[PDB]
């Protein structure tokens, strides 16, 4: 349920589905990698870990959302080519994302 809500509002802001797709795919892969790390560490599937994952659902997509918003806005305003525009937007937004 959380995921769909996390999805829903994003589209409501992006007003275009294809933009909203990119943030969505990030979460399932991150959760699957978290499951792999739990397997390696030996952690079990507890209500505590699942609640932490529910809390994470929102945080996980923030990194993708920032870059998506930056690329969309810069493309809409400047109007440059999608590929060069997205490479540039990645150049600007690297430090805030990593921090």
């Amino acid at each position: 349920e959380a995921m769909v809500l996390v999805f829903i509002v994003m589209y409501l802001f992006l007003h275009n589905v294809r933009y909203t797709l990119i943030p969505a795919i990030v979460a399932p892969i991150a959760l699957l990698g978290t499951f792999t790390v739990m397997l390696l560490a030996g952690f079990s599937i507890n209500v505590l870990t699942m609640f932490g994952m529910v809390l994470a659902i929102g945080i996980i997509v923030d990194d993708a959302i920032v870059v998506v918003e930056n690329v969309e806005r810069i493309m809409a305003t400047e109007g440059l080519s999608p590929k060069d525009a997205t490479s540039k937007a990645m150049k600007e937004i690297t430090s805030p994302i990593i921090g």
Partner: protein, 50 residues
């Protein structure tokens, strides 16, 4: 630069496929329980003096 995977989508795609596959494989083997072993361990000693 952090542009290597931007240059070629295939590498990022295969990395994502590996992460997805390994997680799908991992989920079945994980133990399931309501709560972890948070409680303090207890050891009991029994002596009988009839």
């Amino acid at each position: 630069m952090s542009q290597f995977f931007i240059r070629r989508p295939v590498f990022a795609w295969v990395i994502a496929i590996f992460i997805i596959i390994f997680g799908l494989l991992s989920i079945p083997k994980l133990p399931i329980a309501r709560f972890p072993s948070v409680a303090p361990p207890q050891v009991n000693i029994s002596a009988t003096y009839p």
